Amino acid sequence: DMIHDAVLDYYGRRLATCSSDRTIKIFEIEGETQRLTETLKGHDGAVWCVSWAHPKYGNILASAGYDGKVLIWRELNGAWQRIFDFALHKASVNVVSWSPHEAGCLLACASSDGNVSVLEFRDNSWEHSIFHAHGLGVNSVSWAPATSPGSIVRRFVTGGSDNALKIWAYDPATNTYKLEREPLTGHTDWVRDVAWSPTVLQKSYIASASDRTVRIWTSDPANPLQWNCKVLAAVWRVSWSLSGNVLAASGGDNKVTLWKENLKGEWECVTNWGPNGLLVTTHHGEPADGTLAASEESVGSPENLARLQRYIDSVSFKEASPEFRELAQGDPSWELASLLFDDNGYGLPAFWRQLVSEATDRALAQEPEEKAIICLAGNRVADACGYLLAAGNFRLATLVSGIGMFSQPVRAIYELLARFGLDWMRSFGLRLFYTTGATANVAEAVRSFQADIEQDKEPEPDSALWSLLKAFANQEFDWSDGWLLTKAIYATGKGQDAAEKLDKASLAYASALTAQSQWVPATFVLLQLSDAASREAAVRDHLGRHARRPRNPNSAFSSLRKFGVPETWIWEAKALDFRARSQQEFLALVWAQNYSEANQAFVHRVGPDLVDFRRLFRFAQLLFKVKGKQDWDRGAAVYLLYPMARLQGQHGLDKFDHQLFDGLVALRGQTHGDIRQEAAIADMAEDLIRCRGGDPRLFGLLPEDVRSKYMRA
Amino acid sequence: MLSRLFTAATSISHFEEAHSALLSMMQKSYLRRLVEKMCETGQSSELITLPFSGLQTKVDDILVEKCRATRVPYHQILYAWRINHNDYRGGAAILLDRLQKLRRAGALDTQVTRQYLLLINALSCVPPQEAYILEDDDLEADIDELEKKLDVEGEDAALIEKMKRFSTRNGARRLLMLADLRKQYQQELDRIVAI
Amino acid sequence: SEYRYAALAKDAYQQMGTAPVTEPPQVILGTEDLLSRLYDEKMDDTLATAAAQLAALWREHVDETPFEKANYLANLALQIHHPLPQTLFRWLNEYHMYGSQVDDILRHRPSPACHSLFWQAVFIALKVGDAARLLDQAGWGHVYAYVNVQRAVDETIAVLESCPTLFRVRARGLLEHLRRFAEGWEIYENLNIVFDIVLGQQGAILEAAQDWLEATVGLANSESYLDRLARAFHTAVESDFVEIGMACVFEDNIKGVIGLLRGWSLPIAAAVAEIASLGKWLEVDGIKDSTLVQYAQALADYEGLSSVQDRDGWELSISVLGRMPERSEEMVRDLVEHLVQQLHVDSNATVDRLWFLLNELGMIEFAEDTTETYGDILARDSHRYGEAMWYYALAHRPNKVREVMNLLTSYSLIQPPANDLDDYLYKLLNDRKNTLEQCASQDMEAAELLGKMLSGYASLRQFYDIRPHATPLSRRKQAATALISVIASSDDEDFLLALLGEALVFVSDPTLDQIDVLLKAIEDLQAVGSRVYNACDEFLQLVLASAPGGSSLVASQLQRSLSGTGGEDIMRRLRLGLAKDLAGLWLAEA
Structure with a gap:
């Protein structure tokens, strides 16, 4: 326990x-x-x-x-x-x-x-x-x-x-x-x-846990520093996580405090312990069985993954560039943000007009008049002027004069002719339609709205359009809202300096997409880093754990190759996984054209796999075709020279039989504490004793002694 | 039919002379018979008396060939261990392992546990690097294709010609280790404790 | 006023002291009666036995004075506690004065003529009706002239001889005869006041007051008593101090009497209190710890003569110690510990008796610490062993017993005679069935379970003693391997490897089941760890060197096995050897 x-x-x-x-x-x-x-x-x-x-x-x-x-x-x-x-x-x-x-x-x-x-x-x-x-x-x-x-x-x-x-x-x-x-x-x-x-970045982060305080040193090419958070039981163990540069802190509070990094500089929080975050994006607790999956909290990515895959399939063809109207498609966010940079150039008061044209339809229901104002909040003023033409008398004469340039309706109409009164999702648009026009400005409306909501309550909570339209005035970063439109916003207008932070956000979104039971899109986004060594190593290891879970057919491999990933790392990592899983496992790296020395060291696995002759002959033929680099080819060809003596059977030495005997002896002397190898070479030695003379290649005490005592008889 | 009368006329008592009749002989296939008689009567006596190791190889292969019959009352295999205790301890352990595999595919405690105990006994009896035990798609097409793909890329020529000749000439063992059976016994005991 | 006499009595035995003057038989009989009255806890039997104790006290008085007075107080108290006026008149005979009245009346019965000291003797006489019978035949005839008197006297006697609910009828008839006699010199007045005494009036009983107790008796509840004393001390009769003692015995203040008896020499005070705690109800604390300290400190120096049965000693002290309140164990702890401080003595009788006493109640822990620290006493240097081991076995602590066992078998492995010759007397439990049957008679669940831990070393030493034909040697070897296997199970004990090694050398070095068990033991020893192997090997290295002292070939083979130039080989010899023994013995088909 x-x-x-x-x-x-x-x-x-x-x-x-x-x-x-x-x-x-x-x-x-x-x-x-x-x-x-x-x-x-x-x-x-x-x-x-x-x-x-x-x-x-x-x-x-x-x-x-x-x-x-x-x-x-x-x-x-x-x-x-x-x-x-x-x-x-x-x-x-x-x-x-x-x-x-x-x-x-x-x-x-x-x-x-x-x-x-x-x-x-x-x-x-x-x-x-x-x-x-x-x-x-x-x-x-x-x-x-x-x-x-x-x-x-x-x-x-x-x-x-x-x-x-x-x-x-x-x-x-x-x-x-x-x-x-x-x-x-x-x-x-x-x-x-x-x-x-x-995590491989421009700097190396070190976590230090003790006095119930925790230091996090950021080691750039200089002297690192930290911001000790006075969280106050004692913190014993801290485990890092290659799943968004996550930092798991663990002390005596019957819980594990997870720490993520913000772009500001502070870290947001999401007997013994001893936790260890798995590299398969999983946190392990010590109750004793723990398996908690930790990932970023956001709106479901399947749609965003579909759009992202649509982006990859429409960009990756040779060997990149982030477009706007090329990958906009159905989602209103892209289409809105695309024409949002131009100061109402591509009909800004028309798109939102269509938005409220699909939104106000539910607000005009059960409204007996009042629907005039409810429609005035909408883009169109025609139906509003019509309902105000029905009743309200001469009030229309003002309303139609507002669309060209003792009562709540009169107060609201008069106030809108020159506060909001109520609350809705169309509120900002309503303020945009009746605070502009006198100068036809958009930034002024957004800024005034920003000040108003800075002096108001419950305004525009948790929205993408929020960051979208707020990005126009003071082009910087605010909060989270896909990263494609972010890079697209980086290409044209704007968030200066923090390019390496864009690297870290793309790495964070990469590991986020990697934790969403996906490898290929993760492989693509991980291949979109700034540094070369970082991208290479990350993609390499990620392909390790990806191919760990990737066959030759197109359905997987052509999807892994369409991204632009070389056929060297994929197969090498696949065989890396296959190593812990067979002798035919290293065959993969053999014909992967990424073996080199590994193919030479594959004989270590070919050894205990002789237990059956034609196969070994074929593998040895493969090793014979590759006479490249220690490269002890003479001592490695012994495996090929064994079925020769095995099929030979007593008519004279091969004049190379002594060469395979010298190779077998040199191998038996070079082979260290591997009982499997020694037993293999001993067996394959005894196999050629009944065929030829077989003076050398004697290993074990019992078989050598007794068989020599029986042969000399 | 004559071999029966020969082996019947052997009449083995304290001889030290029939061994001369063994080294004098064309086919000693009748030996298997007399040994069988020696196994039908009082046993272990042939453990006691042995002419030569080179001659003992024959009777060894004989009793081994009498063990593959899967004749339970296995009898000879136990004997086959005893002789293989004098020399070839490894072979004794191997044959006892084959034995455990035969008994496992057909009470059970007193046999299996004792078999494994004697197995680790012979395991520690034998020095390291000698625990070696026999204990009896569409991928090759890629092998050949990529072979033909790399051969176009790339006195040795005589060795290649020979290699081609033996290529035209072309067209079940296990590996029981120390910790292998050492863990296997623990797994068997764990399975027995899970009952 | 009884409260004042009680308060005065409280300041009376305060100036007094305590002294154990008594002889051993008095104490023995006392604590015997006490223990007989305490172990029984239908109370009339206890009163009878108490009266027997009183008879023993009177016997001790005749055979031979605070004893006397305190005995009188004891008798009086036990008679009051118990027909109260009947037993009061029964104690009237034995006086608490200067002379006697009974001997005076007995010497007044015969007379040639009527004496002048006759009527006062009539007043004293008021066995009562029988005393009046002599008055019926007084004879008279003293100058005298009849005119009668005989009829009147005969009438008075006839009325007096009525009784000796109904008492009220007797009183009514009395008053009727009073009217009858009043309706019809010295004789008249004498008969009148005599009749007044027979009545029960206060004006007649208070008249005849020769003694205070005499007037007290002449008068079924304690309130009637208090009323009697309230009308006795009011007159001028009694004397001030012993008298106050009886004045408290009669009074409701029983506690002060116990205190006064504590002021007397007798420990019988306690006994009285012991009877006052079974019948009656309600410096240091009360009068329960006082008698405790008194008795315990009294017997602490007195051993006493040998009785019919043993009484070592320290028996009565504890028996009265745990005879109190339930705070007896608080004193038992102290006194027993004080005995432990002087327990350091090679004597089994004291500890045995002490255990017999501590096991007579619900105090097992004290006897436990006693026998345990006695085992610590008999640690010594290297003797008694099995006696000591048995004083470790009793009263739990089985790990200590296993420790003594371990040390013993270790001493066997170092030398394997170990416990030999005179040391057999330290054990002498040769029988494994008879001994346990004669030892578990006291404590079954203790002696049987702790006695079932002796089989190992017993059969081991048996094996050492053995080494009928060649087969019992194989039987002995089988037993040995069985024992080694038994002490091989406690591992998944440090002296095991040496044993297994000796047996190893004994078996084969060029059944069936035992071979497999030994092989399983080696298997379970070759995979222990670094903890329980270094100590075993170190012990084996400390075995080959024989300092305090078949096995010769074993020791020689082992001395040639660990010889170096400047443990595992033994096991290798086990594997090879047992593989040979399997190459031979296992092939025994029929």
Whole structure:
């Protein structure tokens, strides 16, 4: 019942659970489908933080216990095997952050003893790099994403229990980690946790949670600062979220405070905890099963997604530009905003006239006269003048004189001839039709209306037309209201400076569309960023998790290629997903023309798949056709040279049989702690002992000894 | 028909001499018969006496061929483990695994649990890197097509000619590991505890 | 005025003191009667036994003085509490004076002629009707001349011999005869006032006042009593101080009497109070903790002679301690703890008796702490073991018993004789059925359950003792493996690996079920963790070194197994060895 951490996998399909009773539970999440599979045990104290690994390095888990030991788990052929244990911390290891796959396979450890060791993953077994940390202990560590696109196949911030943080940078000059710039006194009490933003932007955001205060440092190419919100229980854990640059803060209040960013500079808000926002746009709570989906709150996007797809299909044809009347179609917003820039050039008092022509029809009903005024509020004054011609006597003589230039009707008509009186959606239009004309101005009406509503109550609440017509006078930003018309407003008129904020708003809307069970439009909008590295990396990883959930036929792939995405990242990411899922899985990357070294390292998977000869022959033919780049082709051709000796059967050596023997021996010597590979080469060695002489290629003690004892007999 | 009379005339007592008759012999197919008799009578006696490993290979394949009959009272397989305890511990574990697979496809506790226990016994008996166990569309078209697509893009020529010759010459195993069966047993116990 | 005598009595025993002068049999009989009257909690039987106690007191008086006076007060009080005037006249015979009246009347019965001290003896006499019978045959004839007198006297006697609702009729008939006699020297007046005494008038009873109690008796409720005393002390008879004591016994103030008896030497005061708490109703606090402190401090130094049955001691003290109010445990805690402070003595009798006493009530926790701290006493250095282990077993604390067990079997593994020779006397529970049957007689749910934890080490030591033909060796080995397996289940205990290793060496190093169980044990030990393996291996390293002392080959094989140049190998030998034992034993078809 006392769980301290719950970590989602890279796909959001397998849940990792730690505990206090020395138990590491593994669940299989498929929405609400909770499927318990495997349970692990073997620690002295409570397990604090687990962490999944990037699928490019296989399914690996990193556990840190209260004892100070660090157990690195990994599954082998459908079964979990405890590989390596690293114990070099006098106190408990609180958190262990996972390194990005672009920076190899590292592992930062944070313990409250005085040091923070990073664990490099050698091809065979662990290599350790020891660094020093805060004297009063360390409770936090987080990796920083570098500037590089790579999928198949570097700094990190350390939090402090000494009421301070530090930022470690890699240094090959001494093969250690140097401290380039130290931050000073973020809080007053011990820092509980620190998290680096995975979102790639022009700046790097760092979250620091402690004294019930929270710092959020914005690290531009300069000195970062923060605005500590005095929210007052203690905040223990903070998890970032690549779903709109979201910041989840978690302390002891039986709830998780979610934080989003505003363009002003402030952040709007939407025993242990240990939450972790899944990269599949999902927040995980610790009751113990949590699966809360977090996304931006707005009017339903299916219509907007239809319009957006209509925009993509009408713009993406080669290899872009945001138009107005080319993607306006049915929605009145586009058509209104398009002619709104021109000072009533394309018949502004006619469109709204049509709007009230479809609106006032319900107001003229059940109105016995009064319908004259109700129609006067409408654009047309003909029916108004007619109803005032019916009764009201000479009042008409004024009304018709108003359309050319002791009673509530008389008061309203007189007031309108020169306040609003009542309230409606046509109120602004009514004020626009009878405050202008004397000078034929639109900006004056909008401004006067703005001042009036600044001095009134309940006026124009939650509307798109609000921001639309307010955008004319003082062309800037106000509130949220699609981002297509925003970029369209950026192209022509106007919101100076904040271009990178437009980048962040387009990224926010990108992740918003990505969380709406869609990948292709998300892939398009993510491909519409300012920076090159940012767009490349974002699209790459997003296509990773997209192809994770993308076949060769047109219905998906041609929809992913029509956007303009190269056929390199898609298949590479797809095969990246396929790695954690088969030997025929790497075939995809093989004919993806994006393998290179991966195709050379695919033999590692071809190995345990010989268990069946023609297939291996064909794959080896594929590897034979590609003689490109280590590129140990001579030692890699052994897989092709095996069915040769297998089908050979005793008439003389091939004069290349000794070459495949030397290759098999070199492979058997180079192949490290892989039992599958050794057993495979041993089996395929025994297979060619019954055929030829087979003096080398002897591995295991029992088979070699006994078979040699039986053959020499 | 003669082999029956031969094996009947063998009359195996404390011999140390019939082995000479085994190394003197064209086809030792009658051995399978005498062994069978030796298995029908008092057993384990053939564990005790063994001429040579090279000759023991024959009787090994013989008893193994007597295990594939799925003849439950399996009998010989147990024996087949015992001999494979003296040498080839791995093979003993493998045959015991095959055994567990046979029993699982046909009380159950005392057999399965003991089989897995002896399996981990032979597992720890055998050093690492030796837990190797046998335990017996429209994609290839893309393979060939893209092969023909990349071959147009790109003494070795003799190797390619040979490769083509063996290409014209052209037209079930498992992998039980340490933690594989170690987890399989835990899963079986978990399934038994879920009853 | 009784309240004034009570207040004066309250200031009387304030200057007095307390002194346990009595002999052991008095105390024994006292607490015996008390415990007989308390354990019973149809109250007439208790009154009878109380009267028997009084008879014992009189016996103690005859055999032999505060004892005397306080005994008189006790008897008087118990007679008042109980026909009240009948028992009052019954206590009239035994005087509380200077002489006696009974012996005077008895020596006045015979006479040659009528004496001058005759009529006053008639006043004293008023067994009453029998005393009047002698008056009927007075004889007269003293100078005298008849004219009668005989008829009148015979009439008065006939009326007097009526009784000894109806009392009112008797009084009415009396008044009628008064009218009859009045309608028809010294004799006349004498007969008149005698008749007035027989009546019950105040003007006649107050006349004959030789003693205050004498006039008090001559007069079914306590109000009638208070009225009698209100008209007795008003006259000038009684004396001021013991007399105040009886003046309070008669009065409604019973408490002051108990206080005065507390002022007397006797602890019987308590007993009186104990009877005053079962019948009657209502410096430190009240008179329930006073008698408590008094009695407890009294028996604290007195051991007493040996009775028919044992009384170690400290029995009566606790029996009266928890005989109070329900704040008895507050004092039980203090006194028992005071006994614990001096409990540090190798004596089982004291703790056994103390437990027998503390288990006589609803006080289990005190006996628990007692036997527990006694187990702490018998920690010592390395003796008594199983006695001490039994004083750990009793009164819960099973983890401590398992701890002693663990230390014992550990000491067995280090050396495996362990508990041998004289140490057998510390156990001597050789039988597993008879012993438990003779031990669970006291506490079943305790001795049986805690006694069911002894099977392991018992059969283990049995196995150590064993090592009829070759098969009972296999039976002993089977038992050993069974026990090791039993103490192998408590893991998912630190001394287990060494045991399993010795048995490991014993089995095979080049049934059936036991092999599978041992294999399951190794499987359940090879996947524990870092916690319960380092300690086991460390213990194994502390076993091979024999400091306080078949197994020789085991120790030699293990000493050659951990030898280095400058634990897992044992398990490997288990796998190989048991795989061999399965290669041999499992192939036993028939």
